[PDB]
Amino acid sequence: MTEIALIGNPNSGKTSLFNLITGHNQRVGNWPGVTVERKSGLVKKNKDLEIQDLPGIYSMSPYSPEAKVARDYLLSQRADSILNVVDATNLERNLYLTTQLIETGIPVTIALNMIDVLDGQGKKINVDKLSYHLGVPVVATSALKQTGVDQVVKKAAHTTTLAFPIYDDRLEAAISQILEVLGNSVPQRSARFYAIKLFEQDSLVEAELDLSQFQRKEIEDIIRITEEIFTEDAESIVINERYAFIERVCQ
Ligand SMILES: Nc1nc2c(ncn2[C@@H]2O[C@H](COP(=O)(O)OP(=O)(O)O)[C@@H](O)[C@H]2O)c(=O)[nH]1
Ligand code: ALF
Numbered sequence: 001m002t003e004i005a006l007i008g009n010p011n012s013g014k015t016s017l018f019n020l021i022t023g024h025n026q027r028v029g030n031w032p033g034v035t036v037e038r039k040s041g042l043v044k045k046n047k048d049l050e051i052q053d054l055p056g057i058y059s060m061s062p063y064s065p066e067a068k069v070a071r072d073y074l075l076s077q078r079a080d081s082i083l084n085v086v087d088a089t090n091l092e093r094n095l096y097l098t099t100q101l102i103e104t105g106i107p108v109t110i111a112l113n114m115i116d117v118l119d120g121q122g123k124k125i126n127v128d129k130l131s132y133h134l135g136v137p138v139v140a141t142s143a144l145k146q147t148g149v150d151q152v153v154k155k156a157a158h159t160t161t162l163a164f165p166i167y168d169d170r171l172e173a174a175i176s177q178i179l180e181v182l183g184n185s186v187p188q189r190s191a192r193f194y195a196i197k198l199f200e201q202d203s204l205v206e207a208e209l210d211l212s213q214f215q216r217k218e219i220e221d222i223i224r225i226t227e228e229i230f231t232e233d234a235e236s237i238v239i240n241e242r243y244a245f246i247e248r249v250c251q
């Protein structure tokens with residue numbers, strides 16, 4: 001059964017989209033942190049697709065156990081599609097998560113939600129330019145006005161039938177070296193995600209993966225060599241490459 005996962009920042013409208021897609025009446029509230037558990041439901045206009053409502057999340061190195069529920073679901077390899085719910089009134093902040101979702105190798109479709117709010121402010125966003133620079137389908141949606149919801153579900157269903165944010169070309173060299181140290185120690189689909197997180201020295205990924213001391217000592221040397229090349233800390237290199245890529249989008 002094809003599983004689509006609603007992933008986005010808190011209070012972006014994920015459960016609101018879920019209810020309209022499923023006909024369910026799950027808890028919707030105008031404050032972050034309503035949804036704390038995963039909830040499933042069939043797409044009413046396509047009973048072959050099962051969609052998953054998930055708690056809000058800012059980062060795949062999450063800051064809360066509720067956000068880690070969404071992260072753990074994605075890394076369980078059950079999801080066939082990521083329906084990235086993006087708050088259009090915070091494009092740049094939401095897109096930080098987006099870059100990490102694309103890196104998971106699970107195909108990403110963006111629901112650019114709350115577009116009615118940005119219409120009231122008179123601001124426009126070209127979905128074609130954003131889709132081109134991000135490498136994923138993008139559909140403007142309104143859960144309040146009930147617009148674009150059916151379109152983003154059908155395109156999310158078709159991304160399961162990938163181009164990654166290309167970063168500093170010195171960072172991509174380290175990433176590919178870490179990938180060859182990993183070999184089959186990670187799922188092929190999300191190998192880039194794990195390579196980057198190991199470069200970030202992410203505690204969760206380090207504990208989750210079962211790497212030999214031979215693998216770790218080389219990864220430590222790739223990071224150290226690359227840190228000296230960049231004259232910058234490893235964690236810092238990845239964060240600024242993400243934000244530099246996001247700014248390149250909105251230009
Ligand atoms: N104006 C507007 N408000 C929305 C939209 N989608 C959700 N909301 C509101 O945003 C708040 C949070 O919605 P929820 O669906 O609970 O967000 P989640 O935290 O992503 O599950 C609620 O007050 C919803 O009515 C939308 O497209 N437009
Ligand atoms: F903040 Al929520 F569902 F309530 F992401």
Ligand SMILES: [Cl-]
Binds near residue numbers: 061063
């Ligand atoms: Cl988070």
Ligand SMILES: [K+]
Binds near residue numbers: 029031
């Ligand atoms: K909410």
Ligand SMILES: [Mg+2]
Binds near residue numbers: 014015034054
């Ligand atoms: Mg919710």
